[PDB]
Amino acid sequence: XGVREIAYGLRRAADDVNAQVER
Amino acid sequence: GMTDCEFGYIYRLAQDYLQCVLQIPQPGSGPSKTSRVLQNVAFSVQKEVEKNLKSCLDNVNVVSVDTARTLFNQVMEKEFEDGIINWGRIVTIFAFEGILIKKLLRQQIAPDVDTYKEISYFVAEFIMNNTGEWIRQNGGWENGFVKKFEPK
């Protein structure tokens, strides 16, 4: 599934992407 | 520059990415360096999200632009409700509009060739109104996003 799983799944993928260029 | 947070620039980025996903890139000079960097990073995220959330996404039906807009707004609201903004989250906005346009292509009841122009419009609406201030304060697209995500 639903809005929640999608949105917080997106959030998790984002904060990972972000952290992996945050040097 | 500092003006790249204006609506027209963001709209072009969002439209460029949907044209990439739909494999209808416009001819001429080609996309800007910002768009070129963004398309690679956003598509990487899109593929991973499509794989990890296949069950939830396969369960969704994006049958109209209005349903796409309402779902986009509902999902973005929850993703950003904690008040945190960063470049990774901005990338997932583009990735999600790519997911939406792909589902619309298959599921839109009354398909229309200007659909991706409408999707990119309300995507730019959200980016400018909810993250534009942060983007400006962090160097914009040229001095912020491209500097962090371009090849080393």
Author numbering:
A (entry chain B): 1 to 23
B (entry chain A): 0 to 151
Provide the authors' own sentences about this structure as they appear in the paper:
Anti-apoptotic members of the Bcl-2 family are broadly recognized as promising cancer therapeutic targets. Human anti-apoptotic proteins Bcl-2, Bcl-xL, Bcl-w, Mcl-1 and Bfl-1 have a globular, helical fold and function by binding to short, α-helical Bcl-2 homology 3 (BH3) motifs in pro-apoptotic proteins, as shown in Figure 1A. Competition for binding among BH3-containing proteins regulates mitochondrial outer membrane permeabilization (MOMP), which is an irreversible step toward caspase activation and cell death. The role of anti-apoptotic protein Bfl-1 in cancer is less characterized than that of Mcl-1 or Bcl-xL, but many lines of evidence suggest that Bfl-1 is also a critical target. Thus, Bfl-1 is an intriguing therapeutic target and biomarker for resistance to cytotoxic anticancer drugs.
Subsequent rational introduction of an acrylamide moiety to covalently react with Bfl-1 further enhanced Bfl-1 inhibitor specificity. More recent work has shown, as we demonstrate here, that reaction of an electrophilic group on a Bfl-1 inhibitor with a cysteine near the BH3-binding site confers both infinitely tight and covalently selective interactions with Bfl-1 in preference to other Bcl-2 protein family members. Covalent peptide inhibitors had N-terminal acrylamide and C-terminal amidation. Crystals of Bfl-1 in complex with PUMA, FS2 or FS2_1fX peptides were grown in hanging drops over a reservoir containing 1.8 M ammonium sulfate, 0.1 M MES pH 7.0 at room temperature. The PUMA and FS2_1fX complex data sets extended to 1.33 Å and 1.73 Å, respectively, and were phased with the Bfl-1 chain of the FS2 complex model. For example, the structures of FS2 bound to Bfl-1 can be used to design chemical crosslinks to reinforce helicity and promote cellular uptake, the structure of FS2 bound to Mcl-1 can be used to further reduce Mcl-1 binding, and the structure of FS2_1fX can be used as a platform for the design of therapeutic peptides and small molecules that covalently target Bfl-1.
